[PDB]
Structures are given as structure tokens and as C-alpha cells.
Coordinates of C-alpha atoms in Angstrom, one line a residue:
Chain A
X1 CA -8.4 -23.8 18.6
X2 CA -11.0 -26.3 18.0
X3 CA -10.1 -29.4 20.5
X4 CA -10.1 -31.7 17.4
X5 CA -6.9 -29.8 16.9
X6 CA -5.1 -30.2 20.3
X7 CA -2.1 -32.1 20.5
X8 CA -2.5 -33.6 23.8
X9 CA 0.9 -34.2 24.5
X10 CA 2.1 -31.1 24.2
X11 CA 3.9 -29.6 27.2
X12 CA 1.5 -27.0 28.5
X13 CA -1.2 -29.9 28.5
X14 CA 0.9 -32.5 30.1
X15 CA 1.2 -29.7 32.7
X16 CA -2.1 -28.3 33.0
X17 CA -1.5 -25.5 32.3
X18 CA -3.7 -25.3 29.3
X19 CA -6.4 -26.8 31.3
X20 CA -6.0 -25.1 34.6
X21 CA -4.8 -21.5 33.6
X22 CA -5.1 -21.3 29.5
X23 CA -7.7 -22.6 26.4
X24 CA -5.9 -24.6 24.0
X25 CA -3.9 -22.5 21.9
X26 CA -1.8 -22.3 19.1
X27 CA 1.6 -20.6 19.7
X28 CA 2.3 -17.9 17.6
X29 CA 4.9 -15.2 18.7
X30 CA 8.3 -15.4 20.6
X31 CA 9.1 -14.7 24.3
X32 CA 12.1 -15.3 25.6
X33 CA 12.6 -15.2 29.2
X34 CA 16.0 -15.4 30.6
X35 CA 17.3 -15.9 34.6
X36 CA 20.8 -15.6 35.4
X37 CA 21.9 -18.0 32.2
X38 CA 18.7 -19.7 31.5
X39 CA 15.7 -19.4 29.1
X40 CA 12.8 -20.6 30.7
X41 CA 11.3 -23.7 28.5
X42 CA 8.0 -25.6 29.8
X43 CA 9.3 -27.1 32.9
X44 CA 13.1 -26.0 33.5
X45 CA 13.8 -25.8 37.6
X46 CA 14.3 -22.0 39.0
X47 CA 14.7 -22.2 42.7
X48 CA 13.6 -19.7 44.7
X49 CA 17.2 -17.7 45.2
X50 CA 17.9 -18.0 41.2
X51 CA 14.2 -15.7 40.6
X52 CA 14.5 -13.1 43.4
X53 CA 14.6 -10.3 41.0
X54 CA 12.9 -9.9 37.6
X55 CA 13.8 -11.8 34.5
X56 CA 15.2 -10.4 31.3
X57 CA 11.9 -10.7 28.9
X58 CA 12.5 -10.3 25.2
X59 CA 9.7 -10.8 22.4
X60 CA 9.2 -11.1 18.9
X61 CA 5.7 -10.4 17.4
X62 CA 3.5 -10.1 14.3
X63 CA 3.2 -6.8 13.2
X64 CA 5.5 -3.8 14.3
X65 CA 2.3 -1.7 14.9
X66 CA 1.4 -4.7 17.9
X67 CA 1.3 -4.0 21.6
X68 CA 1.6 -7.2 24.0
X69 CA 0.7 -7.7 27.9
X70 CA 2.8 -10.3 29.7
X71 CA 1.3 -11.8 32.7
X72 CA 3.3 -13.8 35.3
X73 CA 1.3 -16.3 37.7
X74 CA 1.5 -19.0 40.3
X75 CA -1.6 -21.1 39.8
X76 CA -0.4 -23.6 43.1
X77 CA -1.2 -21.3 45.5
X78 CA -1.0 -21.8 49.0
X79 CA -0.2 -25.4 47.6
X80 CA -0.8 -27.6 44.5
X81 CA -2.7 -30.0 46.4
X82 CA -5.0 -26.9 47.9
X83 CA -4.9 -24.0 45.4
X84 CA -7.2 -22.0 46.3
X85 CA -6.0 -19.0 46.2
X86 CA -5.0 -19.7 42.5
X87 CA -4.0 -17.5 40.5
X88 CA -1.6 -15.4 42.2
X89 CA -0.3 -12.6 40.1
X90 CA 3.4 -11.9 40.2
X91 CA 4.0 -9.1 37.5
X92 CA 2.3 -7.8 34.9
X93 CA 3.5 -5.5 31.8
X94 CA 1.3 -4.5 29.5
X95 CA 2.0 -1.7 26.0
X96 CA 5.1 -3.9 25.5
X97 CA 6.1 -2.6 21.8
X98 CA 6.3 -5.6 19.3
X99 CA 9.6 -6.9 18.6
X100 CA 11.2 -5.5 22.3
X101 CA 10.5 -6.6 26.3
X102 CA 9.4 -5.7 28.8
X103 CA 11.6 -3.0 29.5
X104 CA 10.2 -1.0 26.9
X105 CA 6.5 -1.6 28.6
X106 CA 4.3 -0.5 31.3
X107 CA 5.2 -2.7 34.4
X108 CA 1.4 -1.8 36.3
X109 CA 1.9 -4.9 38.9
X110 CA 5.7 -4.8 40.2
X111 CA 7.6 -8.1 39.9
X112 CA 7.1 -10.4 43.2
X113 CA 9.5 -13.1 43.8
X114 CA 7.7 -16.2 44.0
X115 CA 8.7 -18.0 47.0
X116 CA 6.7 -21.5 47.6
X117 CA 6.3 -22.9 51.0
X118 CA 4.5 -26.1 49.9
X119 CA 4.7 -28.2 47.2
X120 CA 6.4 -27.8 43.5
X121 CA 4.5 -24.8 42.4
X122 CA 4.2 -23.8 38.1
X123 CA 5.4 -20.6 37.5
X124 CA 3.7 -19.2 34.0
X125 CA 4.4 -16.4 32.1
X126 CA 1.7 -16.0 29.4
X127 CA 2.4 -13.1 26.4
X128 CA -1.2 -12.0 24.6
X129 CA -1.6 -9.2 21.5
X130 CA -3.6 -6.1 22.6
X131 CA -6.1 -4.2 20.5
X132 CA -4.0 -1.1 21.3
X133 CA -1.8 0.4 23.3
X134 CA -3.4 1.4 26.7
X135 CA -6.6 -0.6 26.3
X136 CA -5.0 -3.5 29.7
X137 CA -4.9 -2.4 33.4
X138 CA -4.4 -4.1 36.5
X139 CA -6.5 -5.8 39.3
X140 CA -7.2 -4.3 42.1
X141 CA -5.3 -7.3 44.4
X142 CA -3.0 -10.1 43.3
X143 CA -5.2 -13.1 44.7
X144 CA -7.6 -15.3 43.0
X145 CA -6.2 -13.6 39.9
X146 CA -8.2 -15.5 36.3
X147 CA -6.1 -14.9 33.6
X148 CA -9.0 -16.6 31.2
X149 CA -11.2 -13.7 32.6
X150 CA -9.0 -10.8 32.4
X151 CA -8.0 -12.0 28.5
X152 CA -11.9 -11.8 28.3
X153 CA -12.0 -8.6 29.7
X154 CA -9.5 -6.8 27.9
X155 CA -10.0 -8.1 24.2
X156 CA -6.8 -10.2 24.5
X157 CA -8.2 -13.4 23.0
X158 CA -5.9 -16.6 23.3
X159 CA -2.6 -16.4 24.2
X160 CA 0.2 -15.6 21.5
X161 CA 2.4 -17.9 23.7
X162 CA 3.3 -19.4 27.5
X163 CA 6.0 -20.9 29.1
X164 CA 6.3 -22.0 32.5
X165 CA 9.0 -23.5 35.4
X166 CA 8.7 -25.2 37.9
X167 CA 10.0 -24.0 41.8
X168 CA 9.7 -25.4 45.0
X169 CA 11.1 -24.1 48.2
X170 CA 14.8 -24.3 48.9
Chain B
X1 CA 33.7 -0.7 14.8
X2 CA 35.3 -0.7 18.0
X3 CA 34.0 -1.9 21.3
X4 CA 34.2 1.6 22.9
X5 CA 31.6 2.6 19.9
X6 CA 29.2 -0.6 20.2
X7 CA 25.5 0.3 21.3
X8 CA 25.0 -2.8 23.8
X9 CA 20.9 -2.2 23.6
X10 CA 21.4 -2.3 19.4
X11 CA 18.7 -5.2 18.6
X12 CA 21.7 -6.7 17.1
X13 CA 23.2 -7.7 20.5
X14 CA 20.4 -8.1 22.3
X15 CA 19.6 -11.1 20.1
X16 CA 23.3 -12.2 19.6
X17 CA 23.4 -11.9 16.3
X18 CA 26.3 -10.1 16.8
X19 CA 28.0 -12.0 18.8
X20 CA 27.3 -15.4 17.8
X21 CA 27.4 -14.4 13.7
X22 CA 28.9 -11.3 13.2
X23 CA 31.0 -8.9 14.4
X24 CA 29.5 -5.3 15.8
X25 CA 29.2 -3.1 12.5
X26 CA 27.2 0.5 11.9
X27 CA 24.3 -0.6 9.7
X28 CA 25.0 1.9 6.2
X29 CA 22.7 0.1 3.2
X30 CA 18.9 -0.4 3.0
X31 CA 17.8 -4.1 3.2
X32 CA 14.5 -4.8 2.7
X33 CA 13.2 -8.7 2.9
X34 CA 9.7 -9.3 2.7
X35 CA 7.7 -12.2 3.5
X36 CA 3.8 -12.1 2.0
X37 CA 2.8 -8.5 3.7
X38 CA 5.6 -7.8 6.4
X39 CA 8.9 -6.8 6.2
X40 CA 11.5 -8.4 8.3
X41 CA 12.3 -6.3 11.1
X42 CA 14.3 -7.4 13.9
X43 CA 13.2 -9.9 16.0
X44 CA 9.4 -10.5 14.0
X45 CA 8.0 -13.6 14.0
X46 CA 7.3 -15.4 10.6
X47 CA 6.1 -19.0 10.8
X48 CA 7.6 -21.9 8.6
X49 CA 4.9 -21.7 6.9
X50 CA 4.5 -18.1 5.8
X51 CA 8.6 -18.5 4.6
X52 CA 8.1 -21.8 2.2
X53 CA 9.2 -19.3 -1.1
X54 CA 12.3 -17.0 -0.9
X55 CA 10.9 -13.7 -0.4
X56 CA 11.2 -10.2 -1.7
X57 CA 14.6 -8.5 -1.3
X58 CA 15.6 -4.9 -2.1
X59 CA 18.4 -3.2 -1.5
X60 CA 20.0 0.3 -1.5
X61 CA 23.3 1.0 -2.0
X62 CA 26.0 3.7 -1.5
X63 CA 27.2 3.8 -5.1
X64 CA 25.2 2.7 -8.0
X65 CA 28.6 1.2 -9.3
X66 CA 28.8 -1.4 -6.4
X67 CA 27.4 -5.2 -6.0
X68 CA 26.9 -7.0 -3.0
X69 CA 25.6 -10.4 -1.7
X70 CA 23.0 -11.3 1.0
X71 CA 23.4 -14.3 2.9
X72 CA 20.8 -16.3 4.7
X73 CA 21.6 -18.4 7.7
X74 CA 20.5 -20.0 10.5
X75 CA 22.5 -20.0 13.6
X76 CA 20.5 -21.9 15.6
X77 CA 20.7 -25.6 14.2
X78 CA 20.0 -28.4 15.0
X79 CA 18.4 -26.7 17.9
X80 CA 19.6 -23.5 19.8
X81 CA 20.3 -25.1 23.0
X82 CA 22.9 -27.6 21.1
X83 CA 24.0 -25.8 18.0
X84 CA 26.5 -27.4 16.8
X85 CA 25.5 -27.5 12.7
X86 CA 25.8 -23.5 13.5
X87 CA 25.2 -22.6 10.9
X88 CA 23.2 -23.4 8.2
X89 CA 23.5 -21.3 4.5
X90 CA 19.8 -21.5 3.9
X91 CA 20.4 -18.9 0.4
X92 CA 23.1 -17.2 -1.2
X93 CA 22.7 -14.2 -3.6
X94 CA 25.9 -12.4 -5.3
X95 CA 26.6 -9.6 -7.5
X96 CA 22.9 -7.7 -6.6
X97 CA 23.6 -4.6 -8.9
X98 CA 23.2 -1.7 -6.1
X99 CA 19.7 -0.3 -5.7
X100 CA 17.6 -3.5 -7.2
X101 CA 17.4 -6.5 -5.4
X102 CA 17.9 -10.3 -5.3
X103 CA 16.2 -10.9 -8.4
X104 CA 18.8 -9.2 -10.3
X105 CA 21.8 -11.1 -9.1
X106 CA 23.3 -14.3 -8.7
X107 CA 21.6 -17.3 -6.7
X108 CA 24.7 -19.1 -6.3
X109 CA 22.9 -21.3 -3.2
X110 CA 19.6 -22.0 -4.0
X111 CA 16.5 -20.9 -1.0
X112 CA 15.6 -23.6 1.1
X113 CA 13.0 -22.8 3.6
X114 CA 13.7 -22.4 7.1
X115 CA 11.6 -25.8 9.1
X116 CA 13.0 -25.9 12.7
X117 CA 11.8 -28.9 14.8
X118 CA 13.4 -27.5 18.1
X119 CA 13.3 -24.3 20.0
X120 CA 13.0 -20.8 18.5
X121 CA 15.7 -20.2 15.8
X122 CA 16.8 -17.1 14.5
X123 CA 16.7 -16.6 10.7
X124 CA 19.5 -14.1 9.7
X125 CA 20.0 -12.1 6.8
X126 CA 23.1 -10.2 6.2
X127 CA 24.4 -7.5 2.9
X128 CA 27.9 -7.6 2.4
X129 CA 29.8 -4.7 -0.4
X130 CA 31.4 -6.8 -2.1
X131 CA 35.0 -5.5 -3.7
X132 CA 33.6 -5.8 -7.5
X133 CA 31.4 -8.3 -9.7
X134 CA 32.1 -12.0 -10.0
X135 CA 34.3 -12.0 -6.9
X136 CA 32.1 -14.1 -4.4
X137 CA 31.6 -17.9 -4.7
X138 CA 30.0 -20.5 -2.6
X139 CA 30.8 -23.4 0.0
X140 CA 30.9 -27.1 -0.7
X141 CA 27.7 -27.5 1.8
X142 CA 25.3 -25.4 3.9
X143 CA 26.1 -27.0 7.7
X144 CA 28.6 -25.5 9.6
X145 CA 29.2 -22.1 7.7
X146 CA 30.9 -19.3 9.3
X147 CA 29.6 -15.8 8.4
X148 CA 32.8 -14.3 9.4
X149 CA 35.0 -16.6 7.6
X150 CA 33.6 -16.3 4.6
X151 CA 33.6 -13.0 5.0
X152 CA 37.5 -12.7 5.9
X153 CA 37.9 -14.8 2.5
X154 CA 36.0 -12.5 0.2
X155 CA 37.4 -9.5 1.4
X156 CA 33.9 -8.4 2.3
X157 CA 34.7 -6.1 5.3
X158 CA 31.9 -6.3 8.2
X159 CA 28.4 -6.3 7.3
X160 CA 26.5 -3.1 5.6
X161 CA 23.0 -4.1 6.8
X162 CA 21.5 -7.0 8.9
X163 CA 17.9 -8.4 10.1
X164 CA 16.8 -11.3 11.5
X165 CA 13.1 -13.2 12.2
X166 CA 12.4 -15.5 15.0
X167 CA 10.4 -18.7 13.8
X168 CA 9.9 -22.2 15.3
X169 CA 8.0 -25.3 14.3
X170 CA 3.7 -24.9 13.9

């Protein structure tokens, strides 16, 4: 989107994360992440012990023939106040079929607990429409991961949709 | 069907639509809804904007003597976190002559198109046999139906076909 069509308050700006991780974007397809009995929406709390293992992920999409890539990162790493090591890549799944989850996908970056040490850290899960199926593979190391540059890379253009929560250590 | 015969991975469940609307059933009759150029499959995503008009329906049937009625409802109202207007009769077809569609029965609640202001709602459409013409009738208001009720009342049995879009507010 043009930003003469941003709605600034909307909850990924008010965060950042359109700002620090993602272009302005319209939100187009659904994805449903679900720990223990909650959905993640823009901002919910997940402590650390409540996201030890990988979420349920669901999706809806445009066009049965579609193929998604989910991509989980911390942005706030070591620290919000010093992230220089930002973005650290927790799991990526890519060939998800439209309409299913990530079960149903290629999981090429196992799922890492996040764990923060310092600070309330964001915790963004971003869903993008592929080309085609096996056109999106992984970095070679989780640090200093750009999620604007692998879109780039791979053809992914903006976001289909994001959500994020927020955890801080227990 | 029984619980020892339920598919727990069925779309269906996954989604909660059974579960939340209707009981577990064997799908048995075509239903074919179309939106502009797609074809709701479970779990696509069609925006409020691409469902303003009621769209295409066609239908099979089991016996060119039978009739049946599609219902269209949303569960998820007013949002899906707090549903308590679950749910809301958004269009009411009966008597649809087997093998033809909605434009050969009755529209008995007139389409109004699906506008959620909060969180992703699912948009349900469900094909019930019904036991002969002119049998089916409609509620005094579209908050607060009950799928199954209605069905219990009409002697509709459980569902012959289901499918449901995803859509929230642009």
C-alpha cells in the first residue's frame, strides 16, 4: 500500500511491527494461531512455559491452487532496547497448501521456543503467498534474520497477514 | 453419525463448524457456492467486499424428486471471542428442486451480506433434505438462530453438505 492509505492506528503500527519488521500492508488471508486455548491476536501475553512447543497454525487463503510460507520471528533480540541481533528466526514453514496449516507444510527451520532474558520481546508470525510450491528455502543461520529481504528474495511480495504476542521472561 | 465414525482432521472439526453449528454428518450432496470466480471451499477467504450480492448456488441431489434448503449463517457474531448473537441467519433458501440451484427455490430470508467489525468470522453454508416441498418456514429474526434446532423442528435430519469462508472487516 501507498502510505496515503495506512491507518496509523492500526495494531501492527502502534507496535512497530510494520515499521520495524513489515511494509504497510493490507491484510488479506486468515491465520489462526492457537497455544494451549488461545489465538494469538496483536498483543495477547504468551509466557515463556505457555509456547515451549509449536502452536497449532491454521490458514485460510485465496485460491485453492495457493502455497503460503509462514515465518516466526523475535525482532527484540538480545533486548528491545539493544536489538541487534534482530530478527531472530524461530520456525519457518513454507508449501503450506491453501486453506490447511502448517502441518500440511514443509517445516525447513524447526520450531525454537522463544525464551527472553531481557525485556518484553514481540513475537511475529507473518503468513506471505508463494509463486509456487518449492520456489522458498531457508537461511543458512537464524540471526540477523530480514524478513523484508527474504520476501524480496523469494517473490513473496507483502504479507498476506501478521500477528504478533508479546513474552517476557517468567 | 456416531463419534466412533467421526474423522477428527475433517475440515469440519478443525474449524468447529461442527461442533459449534452442527452435529458430525458424512457429506452426500454437491453444494457449490460461488463468489465472483472462486468457489467456496473450506476455510477460503472472501472479503466483505467480494460477498455484497448473494452468490451462485448449485446443488446435486440424491433423487431428482427431492427439495432441500441452504442456510447461511454466521456463528461468530458480534465477534468470535464473545459470540453471544450466535448466530446470525444471514439467507434462507427452501424447496431448491434437486439438481438446480438457489435460483429455483424459495428465498424465504432475504441475503444480507456478511460485514464483520471484529475478528475473523466464519460464514457457513449448510444443505439440508428436506422431507417434501412447502415443509420449511422461517424464524421471527436472524440473531440467535440455532442450526440444530431448526433442524430438529423440520425434521431435516443432519446436514447433506456443508462449507464455510473465513472473512473479516477490510
Amino acid at each position: 500500500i501507498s502510505h496515503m492509505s495506512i491507518n496509523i492506528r492500526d495494531p501492527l503500527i502502534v507496535s512497530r511491527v510494520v515499521g520495524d519488521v513489515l511494509d504497510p500492508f493490507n491484510r488479506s488471508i486468515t491465520l489462526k494461531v492457537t497455544y494451549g486455548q488461545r489465538e494469538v491476536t496483536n498483543g495477547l501475553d504468551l509466557r515463556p512455559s505457555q509456547v515451549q512447543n509449536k502452536p497449532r497454525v491454521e490458514i485460510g487463503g485465496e485460491d485453492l491452487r495457493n502455497f503460503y510460507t509462514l515465518v516466526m520471528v523475535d525482532p527484540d533480540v538480545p533486548s528491545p532496547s539493544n536489538p541487534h541481533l534482530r530478527e531472530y528466526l524461530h520456525w519457518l514453514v513454507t508449501d503450506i497448501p491453501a486453506t490447511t496449516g502448517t502441518t500440511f507444510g514443509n517445516e525447513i527451520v524447526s520450531y525454537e521456543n522463544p525464551s527472553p532474558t531481557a525485556g518484553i520481546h514481540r513475537v511475529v508470525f507473518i503468513l506471505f503467498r508463494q509463486l509456487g510450491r518449492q520456489t522458498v528455502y531457508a537461511p543458512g543461520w537464524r540471526q540477523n534474520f530480514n524478513t523484508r529481504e527474504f520476501a524480496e528474495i523469494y517473490n513473496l511480495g507483502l504479507p498476506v497477514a501478521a500477528v504478533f504476542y508479546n513474552s517476557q521472561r517468567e
